[PDB]
């Protein structure tokens, strides 16, 4: 079945998946759930999401979003999409760095479920 997500990705986040993970306590069930869309402000998922984002240079020490570089990572038949989403879904917002990337992957999630996704 098609999916827009290049194989490549999985290894290359591999090192640091691990690392985020344990640094903030996240299991593999909560990214599962998470990957199936169900989002609860727990940190330890939110965390891990803000860490794996700040990996990759795509937000910034106060999760801000850098759309350029996150228009550069998809592919071309989501660019109109994402910015799209992104229009709606930035600035970010929350109490915290994990917070709002908790408000922000709800925003997202909501407006393109079809094509979410965690990892
Ligand atoms: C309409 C499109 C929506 C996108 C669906 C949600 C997935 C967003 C996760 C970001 C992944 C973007 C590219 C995926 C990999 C591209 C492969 C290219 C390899 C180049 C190096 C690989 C790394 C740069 C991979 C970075 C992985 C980051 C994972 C972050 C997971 C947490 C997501 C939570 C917040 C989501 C909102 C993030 C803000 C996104 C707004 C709009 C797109
Ligand atoms: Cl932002």
């Not at 691990?18 to 965390?47: F, W, Y």
């Not at 915290?96 to 925003?107: Q, S, T």
């Amino acid at each position: 079945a098609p999916d827009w997500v290049p194989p490549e990705v999985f290894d290359l986040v591999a090192e640091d998946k691990a690392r985020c993970m344990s640094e903030h306590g996240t299991t593999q069930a909560q990214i599962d759930d998470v990957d199936k869309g169900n989002l609860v402000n727990e940190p330890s998922i939110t965390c891990y999401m803000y860490c794996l984002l700040e990996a990759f240079s795509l937000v910034d020490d106060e999760a801000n979003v850098d759309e350029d570089i996150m228009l550069g990572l998809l592919p071309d038949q989501l660019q109109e999409r994402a910015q799209s989403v992104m229009g709606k879904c930035l600035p970010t917002s929350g109490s915290d760095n994990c917070n709002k990337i908790y408000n922000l992957a709800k925003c997202v999630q909501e407006s393109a479920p079809d094509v979410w996704f965690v990892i």
